[PDB]
Amino acid sequence: TLHIYAASSMTNAVNALVADYSQQHDVKLVTVYGGSSSLARQIEAGAPADLFISANEEWANYLVEKGLVKPNKVVTLAANSLVLIRPTAQPVASFELQDAAAWQTALADSRLAVAQVDAVPAGMYAKQALQHAGVWPELESRLAQTNNVRLALALVERGESPLGIVYKTDALLSDKVTIVTAFSAQSHQPIRYPLAQLNDKAASAEWVAYLRSDAAQQILQRFGFESVS
């Protein structure tokens, strides 16, 4: 039994990857999805985990620093971009991201859906982008912060939040939301997903080899992830 801990934004792609792999190989792959920060802290506490996929470099390096992953057992798997979404049934024309007043008009009496901004990668990237737009001090007090990016997505899908900040890949799989605009590359740190191998089991190594292979990369591309050079 292999235990894979993966950022919530990886839910669908890892499910697809497990499915593809599981036909050629007689191994039981068990998956746990959640915010990358929470997953990492669970692993640090001793949770059985063979592999970890984070939505930022920092949480995988956290495990290296603590001595639970060797530095050469982390490889970058994929990249993403960050988007502003709305519920499909609630239209809002795009606006100047640096226009704090246009944010407060779109929000109206609601809150901006984001993952927890201090620790969850999607929240950290959101905060960076809003800081870069020059609108953070205004929006600071108008967030609905969730434990992971998929819970942020769901607030928007339900129409509870009229705007949210998620990854491009999260929007792409949902018909209940529409992309308002994408944040610029300059607005946040490049979104990169490391894959950390937490032990030397042969099965962990063969999984990693598959995840780095062309077959796995084609699946990640189809779910909307970006390649890394």
Give the C-alpha separation, 209 to 7, whole Å. Answer: 20
Tell me the Cα Rg of the chain: 18
Domain count, the chain: 2
The answer to whether 125 is a known ligand-binding residue is: no
Are 3 and 11 within 8 A, CB to CB?
A: no
Residues 187 and 109 in one domain: yes
Using alpha carbons, select from 108, 148, 112, 131 the residue that is nearest to residue 187: 131
The answer to whether 62 is a known ligand-binding residue is: no
The CA-atom distances, in angstroms, between 128 and each of 120, 122, 183, 191 are 12, 10, 10, 12
What are the structure tokens assigned to 164, written together? 């949210």
The CA-atom distances, in angstroms, between 181 and each of 61, 84, 171, 176 are 31, 5, 11, 16
Are 81 and 226 within 8 A, CB to CB?
A: yes
In sequence order, what are the beta bridge partners of 192?
Answer: 79
Residues 86 and 179 in one domain: yes
The resolution in angstroms reads 1.5
Residues 54 and 123 in one domain: no
Q: What technique was this entry resolved by? A: X-ray
Using alpha carbons, select from 186, 192, 133 the residue that is nearest to residue 163: 133
The answer to whether 149 is a known ligand-binding residue is: yes
Phi-psi region of 171 (alpha: psi -120 to 50; beta: other; left: phi over 0): alpha
Q: What domain range is 134 assigned to? A: 80-191
The answer to whether 5 is a known ligand-binding residue is: no
Residues 90 and 136 in one domain: yes
Reduce the DSSP state of residue 3 to 3 states and report it: strand
The answer to whether 167 is a known ligand-binding residue is: yes
Numbers of helices and strands, H then E, in the chain: 10, 10
Using alpha carbons, select from 190, 175, 163, 210 the residue that is nearest to residue 16: 210
Helices of type H across the chain: 11-24, 36-45, 57-65, 100-107, 121-133, 136-139, 149-157, 168-173, 202-211, 214-222
Residues 205 and 187 in one domain: no
Helix (H) or strand (E) holding 146: strand 143-146
Residues 90 and 184 in one domain: yes
Supply the DSSP symbol for 27: -
Residues 96 and 50 in one domain: no
Q: What is the CATH number of the domain that holds 33?
A: 3.40.190.10
At 4, which amino acid appears?
A: I
Contacts of 73 (CB under 8 A, 6+ apart): 196, 197, 198
Residues 154 and 73 in one domain: no
Phi-psi region of 42 (alpha: psi -120 to 50; beta: other; left: phi over 0): alpha
